[PDB]
Amino acid sequence: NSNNLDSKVGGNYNYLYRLFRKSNLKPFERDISTEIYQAGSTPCNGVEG
Amino acid sequence: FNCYFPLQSYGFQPTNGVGYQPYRVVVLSFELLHAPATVCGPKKSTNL
Amino acid sequence: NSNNLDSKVGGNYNYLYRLFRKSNLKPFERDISTEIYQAGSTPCNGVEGFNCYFPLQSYGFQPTNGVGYQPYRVVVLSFELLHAPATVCGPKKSTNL
Amino acid sequence: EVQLVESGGGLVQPGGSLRLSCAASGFTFSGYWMHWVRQAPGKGLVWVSRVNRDGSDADYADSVKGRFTISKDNAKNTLFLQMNSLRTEDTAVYYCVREATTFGVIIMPEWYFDLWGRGTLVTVSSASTKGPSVFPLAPSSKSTSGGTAALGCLVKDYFPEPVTVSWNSGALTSGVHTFPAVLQSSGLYSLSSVVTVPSSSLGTQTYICNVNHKPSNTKVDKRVEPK
Amino acid sequence: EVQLVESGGGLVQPGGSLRLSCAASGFTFSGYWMHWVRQAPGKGLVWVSRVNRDGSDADYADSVKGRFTISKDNAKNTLFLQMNSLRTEDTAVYYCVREATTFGVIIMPEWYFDLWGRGTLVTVSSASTKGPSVFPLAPSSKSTSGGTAALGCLVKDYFPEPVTVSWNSGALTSGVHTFPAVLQSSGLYSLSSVVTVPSSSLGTQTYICNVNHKPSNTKVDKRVEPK
Amino acid sequence: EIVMTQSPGTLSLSPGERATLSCRASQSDSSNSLAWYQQEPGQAPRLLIHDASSRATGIPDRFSGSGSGTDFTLIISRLEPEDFAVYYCQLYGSFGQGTRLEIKRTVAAPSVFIFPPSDEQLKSGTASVVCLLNNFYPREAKVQWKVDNALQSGNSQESVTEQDSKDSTYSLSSTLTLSKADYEKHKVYACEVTHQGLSSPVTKSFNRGEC
Amino acid sequence: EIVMTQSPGTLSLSPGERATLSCRASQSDSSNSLAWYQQEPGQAPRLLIHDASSRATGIPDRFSGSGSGTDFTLIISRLEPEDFAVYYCQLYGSFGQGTRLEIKRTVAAPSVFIFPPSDEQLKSGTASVVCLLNNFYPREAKVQWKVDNALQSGNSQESVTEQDSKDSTYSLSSTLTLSKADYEKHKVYACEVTHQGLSSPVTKSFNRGEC
């Protein structure tokens, strides 16, 4: 339990997790990326639609 | 925490894989030592 | 692996195996027969009676089975090391005497 | 290059027999396992049968079990598919497709097709070939809207295989609508081909329609009256 | 022959209790595995309980659990199934169904059923037994169409078990329409039995309808007027 | 736990044409220990195949099929007049939804007769109007009411009779029940049926008061 | 035995929009033995990838998809005006139904024209009334006919035409066939079209006998 040490008022945004990824994760595989995910029929991965 | 009940259940479900599926085990342990044997195979006797 | 070559829909009945036999097999013994195997006290092997079961059974190799039931092609090579003029060898090149 | 030529097929009464051949050129036909597949008009592809390198083992599908035989010779370099007692549900265009093999220490086909041949159309029905009925379709007053309009022709009771249509010896298209034919009762193929040409143009140039009928070679030309 | 006869059953108020029996004749009842399978009126079937001769496991489905008790009295050759706090949705028919056993070195039951005894219906409702109300159904002028017509009867407020009805002491059929019953509000079964008989036949022979009520022994006979 | 689905939901063919049915387990494999049962509407189910491969003794040689893994399929060699039954498949704990094998015929035009309630029904306190569809095929229809030349639903009931044997045609019934106070206010009651095999929806009207 | 269902049935994309096609195989024992194909409406299918991962010879680099388990997905990197075809997936013993990929466009108001039979069609013995929707998008609508101010169904035939390439629009033609005995009785023939992109359903009336 580290609730009293890793929380900020109004939700803490210093800690982040990946919600969407194109492929499965291999064991002990670390990836960092910033291309915006695409889910529909609108251009993404560099443009906001 | 750090103190568990030594016994746990199996929860054998019919859908589970054959690896976790129940198996009925019977062990027939014999001893062949110095004693008058009381159990023998089905072999017919012969005249002395 | 020969799963995608030796399977037929609804179970393959073109590959059979003897499930019942009256005696043990000797090494390198080949037997073909259809006499009804005897398991009880009723005579069989020529007469169909009680406990007389057909000695042959089918694998039923289905097109999609588990790895333990898929058809696998097996070849066993038996080597004869008896004293005789050798007729098969490797590609080992010969050398001047 | 490497291509497969389909031969045979055409009209045949239900319950008859037919033979289809696939000539192979450009590749070693002996070593590749073969498949035969089909595609119904306007429907998805469906696999039919497979044959070995020697042409002795097959796994005919359930829908074609008993009434289809496959054969694969090596000397004369072609594939046979023979059909008996045909039914109305197999009216389709048949393709023959190769099966890729590693050709290593074990042939081991990967069960996936590489090349698709120019397939052939097989049709089964109780009807017989007959001349199509042609007539113009020109809008009259109160039926044409605006300067632009659409003028066309509808063919009727054309049982034979799909027919081609043209206008003014194919000198203009103006956005030709193909309108593939649709089968109706009693086995009749009909299609209404219309070209969008404004109605305020007839009078200075003649409009002719050509139903180029290849099967029976009954070429028909028709004049469209603006009424 | 080998057969299973079901005993018990009948109307019961909600929250009540009941016991069903299954007498088995023609085979060795104790060795074979036993089961209960339900069948809702006009619905699918769902297995209710599994009993080993020991009966130690697989006996109750969650919803079944807590309310049914399964017993297999081998000494006097019968099966029991007892219920408490029965709910409305369990109104159905029950089948005593066997489970095949190899009877070899290991009995090894195979979880597939061999025979199905004739069903016993169980019904649970808040209604009470009432006499059905019967009135004739004969089309008058401007309602009958053509020479042929149909004459019948319609019963109402008949809660008890499905009723049998016949025409002219069952001396004619003329295509009898069974018209199975159906439930309305306040727990009532309604049936409308109509026989297609031409309207130009009344006057020379009497037209009567009998509704035999077997549960309450309320056999009723009525006449039909041509209006 | 295991949930079994049947494909297709319905299966209509000619009296001679053979058929096949596919059953699917929701997940996992159960060592191919599957059973198929056929149930006539009036009779109890009957086992046809056990262990998903072997057919029980007494079952005709016609029924023969096999499957493995998550999908088991049963094939029927030919067809005879016994397929008027629902085929359920049984795994360890659950039964499939089933598939009714329907016999196929030509399109039949329905006949609709509307019976208004008579005096004895009127004085009981409620009025029930019935509609009878007769000699109709295939088994798909839609019946509504036009009470005071207006469409209302959610108040009537529907009943469909099972297929007959000698002529293989069924009948449908539909009873609309209203209070007498609501029944007397409206004047025109009309019944129509929509059918894909009908050139036009047949409309038949009813004017209250008879003659 | 395998039914290899492609989802979803139809996607519309702008001519430069990437997408993915997800297809589930019934029996997931393929071990990445899969293929995808792109067939133009007027020609044969071609192979796109093999083994569900690797690509064939001459393929564009954009076609690159991977999948495992029951859910096999194929991803396209970008789009060009060639994707107007049918994508057929292939398991070892089955074929997919096919997915239609359409070029998206703004909603267009259809134009409906009704053409009655002429005199030469009148003397043949069968009357055909044709309704033509022209310059219509997207490809979904319902066309209904009115004979004697009454709707009917089960007697007319409808046909669709493939989308053009110069402006990405399609035309729908429908024909109602009847004998002269019915045609002479009626006088008014109307056609209505319903579209979600239209403010009100469009009706067009026709009076028999011309003028």
Give the span between the Cα atoms of D154 and D134, in whole angstroms. 6
What residues contact E61, with CB distance under 8 A and at least 6 apart?
Answer: E46, E47, E48, E49
Angle CA(D182)–CA(G141)–CA(G114) in degrees, nearest 5? 65
What residues contact B17, with CB distance under 8 A and at least 6 apart?
Answer: F28
Assess B19–F contact: CB distance below 8 Å, yes or no: no
Q: Which amino acid is at G3?
A: V
Angle CA(D121)–CA(D167)–CA(D184) in degrees, nearest 5? 45
Assess A12–G contact: CB distance below 8 Å, yes or no: no
The CB density around residue G19, as the number of other CB atoms within 10 Å, is 17
Assess A44–G contact: CB distance below 8 Å, yes or no: no
Token pair 């039926």 is at which residue? D143
Considering just the CA atoms, what is the radius of gyration of chain D in Å?
23
Give the span between the Cα atoms of F185 and F172, in whole angstroms. 28
Give the span between the Cα atoms of E178 and E199, in whole angstroms. 20
Angle CA(F38)–CA(F39)–CA(F40) in degrees, nearest 5? 125
Cβ contact, residue pair F93, B18, below 8 Å: no
Tokens of D224: 């469209």
Tokens of D75: 């000397």
Smallest CA-to-CA distance from A20 within A47, A41, A45 is with A45
Interface test mutation site (partner D, options C5, C15, C61, C74, max chain D beta carbons within 10 A): C5
Tokens of G16: 């430069």
Three-state secondary structure call for residue D129 = coil
Cβ contact, residue pair G27, F201, below 8 Å: no
Backbone angles phi, psi at F180, to 5 degrees: -65, -35
Give the span between the Cα atoms of G97 and G23, in whole angstroms. 10
Strand partners, D25: D3
H or E segment and range at residue E38: strand E33-39
Cis peptide before E41 (omega within 30 of 0): no
Tokens of D18: 């037919």
Backbone angles phi, psi at F73, to 5 degrees: -120, 140
Burial (CB count within 10 angstroms: exposed 0-12, middle 13-18, buried 19+), residue G196? exposed
Assess F66–G contact: CB distance below 8 Å, yes or no: no
Strand partners, E152: E137, E194
Give contacts of F52 with chain G, Cβ < 8 Å: none
Cβ contact, residue pair C9, G1, below 8 Å: yes
Assess G29–C contact: CB distance below 8 Å, yes or no: yes
Cis peptide before F81 (omega within 30 of 0): no
Give the span between the Cα atoms of D180 and G170, in whole angstroms. 13
- DSSP for residue D75: S
Strand partners, E154: E135, E192
Torsion of CA B32, B36, B39, B44, to 10 degrees: 110
Give the span between the Cα atoms of E207 and E204, in whole angstroms. 10
Give the span between the Cα atoms of C1 and C69, in whole angstroms. 11
Backbone angles phi, psi at B12, to 5 degrees: -65, 110
Cβ contact, residue pair B15, F31, below 8 Å: no
Q: What is the DSSP string of G68-136?
A: -SSEEEEEBS---TT--SEEEEEETTEE---EEEEE----B--EEEEE---HHHHHHTEEEEEEEEEEE
Assess F70–G contact: CB distance below 8 Å, yes or no: yes
Q: List, in sequence order, every beta strand (DSSP E) within D125-197.
A: 133-137, 151-156, 164-167, 182-184, 188-195
Assess F197–G contact: CB distance below 8 Å, yes or no: yes
Give the span between the Cα atoms of F103 and G86, in whole angstroms. 35
Cβ contact, residue pair F66, C62, below 8 Å: yes
In angstroms, the separation between the Cα of residue D173 and the nearest Cα of chain C is: 52
For chain F, the chains sharing at least 3 beta-carbon pairs closer than 8 angstroms are B, C, E, G
Q: Could you tell me whether strands G86-91 and G35-39 are parallel, antiparallel, or unpaired per DSSP bridges? A: antiparallel
The CB density around residue F167, as the number of other CB atoms within 10 Å, is 12
Cβ contact, residue pair C9, D62, below 8 Å: yes
CB nearest to F1's CB, from B15, B17, B18:
B15
Half-sphere exposure of E224 (CA within 13 A, CB side): 26
Give contacts of G27 with chain C, Cβ < 8 Å: 64
Chain D residues contacting C via beta carbons under 8 Å: 59, 62, 108-109, 111
Residues across chain C: 97
Residues D92, D40 contacting (CB under 8 angstroms): yes
Smallest CA-to-CA distance from D159 within D131, D136, D122 is with D131
Smallest CA-to-CA distance from G131 within D139, F198, D199, D42 is with D139
H or E segment and range at residue G181: helix G180-185
Assess whether chains D and A touch, using the rule of 3 or more C-beta pairs within 8 angstroms.
Answer: no
- DSSP for residue D77: -
Smallest CA-to-CA distance from F143 within D205, G148, G104, F152 is with F152
Burial (CB count within 10 angstroms: exposed 0-12, middle 13-18, buried 19+), residue D121? middle
As a 3-state breakdown, chain B gives helix, strand, coil percent values, each rounded to 5, of: 0, 0, 100
Interface test mutation site (partner G, options A22, A38, A41, A47, max chain G beta carbons within 10 A): A41
Cβ contact, residue pair G1, F194, below 8 Å: no
Assess F28–B contact: CB distance below 8 Å, yes or no: yes
CB nearest to D116's CB, from G44, G157, G164:
G44
Assess whether chains A and B touch, using the rule of 3 or more C-beta pairs within 8 angstroms.
Answer: no
In angstroms, the separation between the Cα of residue G117 and the nearest Cα of chain D is: 8
Token pair 């020379």 is at which residue? E204
Token pair 């997408």 is at which residue? G19
H or E segment and range at residue F184: helix F180-185
Backbone angles phi, psi at E62, to 5 degrees: -45, -60
Smallest CA-to-CA distance from F97 within F2, F7, F27 is with F7
Give the span between the Cα atoms of E118 and E96, in whole angstroms. 8
Give the span between the Cα atoms of E61 and E65, in whole angstroms. 5
Tokens of A22: 């194109």
Assess G210–F contact: CB distance below 8 Å, yes or no: no
Cβ contact, residue pair D59, C4, below 8 Å: no
Give the span between the Cα atoms of D39 and G39, in whole angstroms. 12
Q: Which of residues 72-101 of G touch C (CB under 8 A)?
A: 92-93
Cβ contact, residue pair G153, F194, below 8 Å: yes
Resolution in A: 3.2
Give the span between the Cα atoms of D157 and C19, in whole angstroms. 65
Give the span between the Cα atoms of C87 and A1, in whole angstroms. 77
The CB density around residue C59, as the number of other CB atoms within 10 Å, is 17
Assess G115–D contact: CB distance below 8 Å, yes or no: yes
Give the span between the Cα atoms of D120 and D161, in whole angstroms. 12
Give the span between the Cα atoms of F204 and C61, in whole angstroms. 62
Q: Could you tell me whether strands G188-194 and G142-147 are parallel, antiparallel, or unpaired per DSSP bridges? A: antiparallel
Give the span between the Cα atoms of D45 and G97, in whole angstroms. 8
H or E segment and range at residue G184: helix G180-185
Give the span between the Cα atoms of F189 and F151, in whole angstroms. 10
Cβ contact, residue pair G161, D137, below 8 Å: no
For chain E, the chains sharing at least 3 beta-carbon pairs closer than 8 angstroms are F
Give the span between the Cα atoms of E199 and F102, in whole angstroms. 34
Interface test mutation site (partner F, options C7, C62, C69, C70, max chain F beta carbons within 10 A): C62
Residues D161, D183 contacting (CB under 8 angstroms): no
Backbone angles phi, psi at E49, to 5 degrees: -150, 150
CB nearest to F200's CB, from G2, G26, G150:
G150
What residues contact E110, with CB distance under 8 A and at least 6 apart?
Answer: E99, E100, E101, E102, F33, F50, F51
Residues C37, C31 contacting (CB under 8 angstroms): no
Assess A43–G contact: CB distance below 8 Å, yes or no: yes
**If phi over 0 gives left and psi between -120 and 50 gives alpha, with beta otherwise, what is residue C67?**
alpha
Half-sphere exposure of E57 (CA within 13 A, CB side): 4
Give contacts of F46 with chain E, Cβ < 8 Å: 116
Assess whether chains F and G touch, using the rule of 3 or more C-beta pairs within 8 angstroms.
Answer: yes
- DSSP for residue D225: P
CB nearest to D112's CB, from G90, G115, G121:
G90
Backbone angles phi, psi at F182, to 5 degrees: -75, -30
Four-residue CA torsion sign, F76, E1, E113, E161: positive
